Amino acid sequence: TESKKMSSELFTLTYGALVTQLCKDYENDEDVNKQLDRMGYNIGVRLIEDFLARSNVGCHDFRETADVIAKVAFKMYLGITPSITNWSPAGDEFSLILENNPLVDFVELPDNHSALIYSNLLCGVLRGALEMVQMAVEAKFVQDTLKGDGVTEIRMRFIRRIE
Amino acid sequence: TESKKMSSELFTLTYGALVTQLCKDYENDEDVNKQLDRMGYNIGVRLIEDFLARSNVGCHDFRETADVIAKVAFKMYLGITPSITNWSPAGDEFSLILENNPLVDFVELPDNHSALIYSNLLCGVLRGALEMVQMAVEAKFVQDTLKGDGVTEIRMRFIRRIE
Ligand SMILES: *C(=O)CCCCCCCCCCCCC
Numbered sequence: 001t002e003s004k005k006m007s008s009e010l011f012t013l014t015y016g017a018l019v020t021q022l023c024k025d026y027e028n029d030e031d032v033n034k035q036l037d038r039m040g041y042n043i044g045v046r047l048i049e050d051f052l053a054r055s056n057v058g059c060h061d062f063r064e065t066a067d068v069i070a071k072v073a074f075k076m077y078l079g080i081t082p083s084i085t086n087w088s089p090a091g092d093e094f095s096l097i098l099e100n101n102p103l104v105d106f107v108e109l110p111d112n113h114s115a116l117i118y119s120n121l122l123c124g125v126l127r128g129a130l131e132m133v134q135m136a137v138e139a140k141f142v143q144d145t146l147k148g149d150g151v152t153e154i155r156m157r158f159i160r161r162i163e
Numbered sequence: 164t165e166s167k168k169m170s171s172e173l174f175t176l177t178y179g180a181l182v183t184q185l186c187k188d189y190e191n192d193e194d195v196n197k198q199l200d201r202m203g204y205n206i207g208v209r210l211i212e213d214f215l216a217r218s219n220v221g222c223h224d225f226r227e228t229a230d231v232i233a234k235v236a237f238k239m240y241l242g243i244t245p246s247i248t249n250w251s252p253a254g255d256e257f258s259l260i261l262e263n264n265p266l267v268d269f270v271e272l273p274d275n276h277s278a279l280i281y282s283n284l285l286c287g288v289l290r291g292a293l294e295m296v297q298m299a300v301e302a303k304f305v306q307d308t309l310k311g312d313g314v315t316e317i318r319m320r321f322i323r324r325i326e
């Protein structure tokens with residue numbers, strides 16, 4: 001059963017509607033951040049099932065994992081291939097560098113909303129999906145083009161191996 | 164500037180999160196229907212700009228319009244090509260037949276939520292985008308696989324030509 005392939009524009013705008021609704025429902029940026037994360041988590045727990053049926057993985061080590069997330073999973077679900085950089089010497093941390101993040105196409109952050117992590121849904125997705133492969137991880141944004149950085153950066157930290 | 168191409172799964176689940184949030188925020192199916200429509204409208208008004216920069220159209224008649232929506236716009240933004248059927252003799256009505264609607268992948272409607280038009284965002288998108296091409300239209304779901312039909316059907320009615 002082949003998956004349907006689409007341009008990112010409707011997705012981007014729909015995600016935009018979700019963030020707007022949440023900002024109306026909460027009025028507090030930190031809370032929006034948290035709800036985006038929780039939703040992302042519930043999404044990742046289901047998404048990993050789809051991924052493992054379209055990819056031959058299952059697993060290895062934290063490095064192999066980084067490679068599969070950037071080169072296969074992001075490409076498949078977002079049409080982009082983030083770069084992997086800045087590995088910690090222990091190999092328990094790495095960064096995903098997103099030069100182009102579809103979620104923020106057509107988006108510009110209003111002032112004083114500096115606490116808002118617009119694409120925070122992605123941290124929840126990552127954490128949730130990885131948990132289903134018996135990997136506890138922490139995902140967090142440390143660079144965001146919406147705040148003026150040259151790139152968007154998601155820092156990934158391996159906490160433990162669920163068993 | 165080429166658009167990024169992605170699988171529909173993350174989009175489907177994200178739209179699912181939006182519907183869930185709205186159902187929590189409203190508790191009333193009719194209202195969810197209306198908000199999905201309004202959001203869809205705001206999305207379509209912007210989306211049409213992207214479309215006209217990726218498509219050579221601008222316009223003709225209601226029939227040509229049907230053809231561009233099903234064969235070019237749906238394919239581009241949702242990865243599917245709906246069929247056009249049941250033209251009214253006056254040529255002011257037609258139906259879009261969606262055998263597969265990405266928005267409802269992995270979705271099953273709970274009971275008593277018969278009034279909910281799960282993918283109603285699409286009616287708003289259509290109405291809004293068409294309005295920007297000086298066409299007033301009405302879009303409405305008359306068949307929905309989520310309610311047991313063999314296909315999903317969106318009935319399109321041309322109201323007037325904005326000028
Ligand atoms: C083991 O060798 C690697 C296991 C990789 C699991 C990846 C799961 C990714 C699914 C969600 C990512 C979504 C990114 C947009």
Ligand SMILES: *C(=O)CCCCCCCCCCCCC
Nearest residue numbers: 220221222223228231236240292
């Ligand atoms: C004139 O000849 C035809 C004009 C067609 C305009 C189509 C606009 C479609 C953009 C939104 C559709 C989204 C469907 C998922």
